[PDB]
């Protein structure tokens, strides 16, 4: 599809896509730490 990421993915600030369940999980999956920010943790 023309969308950036799939329906089950989290969109990193860099534009990289990662599985949504990978947010606030202890690993910097995005590489830019956007999936591990305090903000995303409070959304869990
Ligand atoms: Ca992570």
Curated annotation (Swiss-Prot):
Glycans are attached at residue 40. Ca(2+) 2 binds at residues 22, 25, 27, 29, 35-36. Residues 3-43 form the LDL-receptor class A domain. It is found in: Golgi outpost; Cytoplasm, Cytoskeleton, Microtubule organizing center. Most abundant in liver, brain and lung. Cleaved into a 85 kDa membrane-spanning subunit (LRP-85) and a 515 kDa large extracellular domain (LRP-515) that remains non-covalently associated. Gamma-secretase-dependent cleavage of LRP-85 releases the intracellular domain from the membrane. The N-terminus is blocked. Disulfide bonds join 5-17, 12-30, 24-41. Endocytic receptor involved in endocytosis and in phagocytosis of apoptotic cells. Required for early embryonic development. Involved in cellular lipid homeostasis. Involved in the plasma clearance of chylomicron remnants and activated LRPAP1 (alpha 2-macroglobulin), as well as the local metabolism of complexes between plasminogen activators and their endogenous inhibitors. Acts as an LRPAP1 alpha-2-macroglobulin receptor. Acts as TAU/MAPT receptor and controls the endocytosis of TAU/MAPT as well as its subsequent spread. (Microbial infection) Functions as a receptor for Pseudomonas aeruginosa exotoxin A. It is linked to Keratosis pilaris atrophicans: A group of rare genodermatoses characterized by keratotic follicular papules, variable degrees of inflammation, and secondary atrophic scarring. Most cases are associated with an atopic diathesis and keratosis pilaris on the extensor extremities. KPA is comprised of three distinct clinical subtypes: keratosis pilaris atrophicans faciei, atrophoderma vermiculatum, and keratosis follicularis spinulosa decalvans. Affected individuals may present with features overlapping the 3 subtypes. Developmental dysplasia of the hip 3: An autosomal dominant form of congenital dysplasia of the hip, a common skeletal anomaly in which the normal seating of the femoral head in the acetabulum is disrupted. Its severity ranges from mild instability of the femoral head with slight capsular laxity, permitting minimal lateral displacement, through moderate lateral displacement of the femoral head, without loss of contact of the head with the acetabulum, up to complete dislocation of the femoral head from the acetabulum. Belongs to the LDLR family. Heterodimer of an 85-kDa membrane-bound carboxyl subunit and a non-covalently attached 515-kDa N-terminal subunit. Intracellular domain interacts with MAFB. Found in a complex with PID1/PCLI1, LRP1 and CUBNI. Interacts with SNX17, PID1/PCLI1, PDGF and CUBN. The intracellular domain interacts with SHC1, GULP1 and DAB1. Can weakly interact (via NPXY motif) with DAB2 (via PID domain); the interaction is enhanced by tyrosine phosphorylation of the NPXY motif. Interacts with MDK; promotes neuronal survival. Interacts with LRPAP1; this interaction is followed by rapid internalization. (Microbial infection) Interacts with bacterial exotoxins. This is Prolow-density lipoprotein receptor-related protein 1. The lineage of its organism: Eukaryota, Metazoa, Chordata, Craniata, Vertebrata. The chain holds residues 1011 to 1054 of 4544 of the full protein.
């Amino acid at each position: 599809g023309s969308h950036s990421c799939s329906s089950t993915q989290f969109k990193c600030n860099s534009g990289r896509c990662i599985p949504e369940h990978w947010t606030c999980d202890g690993d910097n999956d995005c590489g830019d730490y956007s999936d591990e920010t305090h903000a995303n943790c409070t959304n869990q």
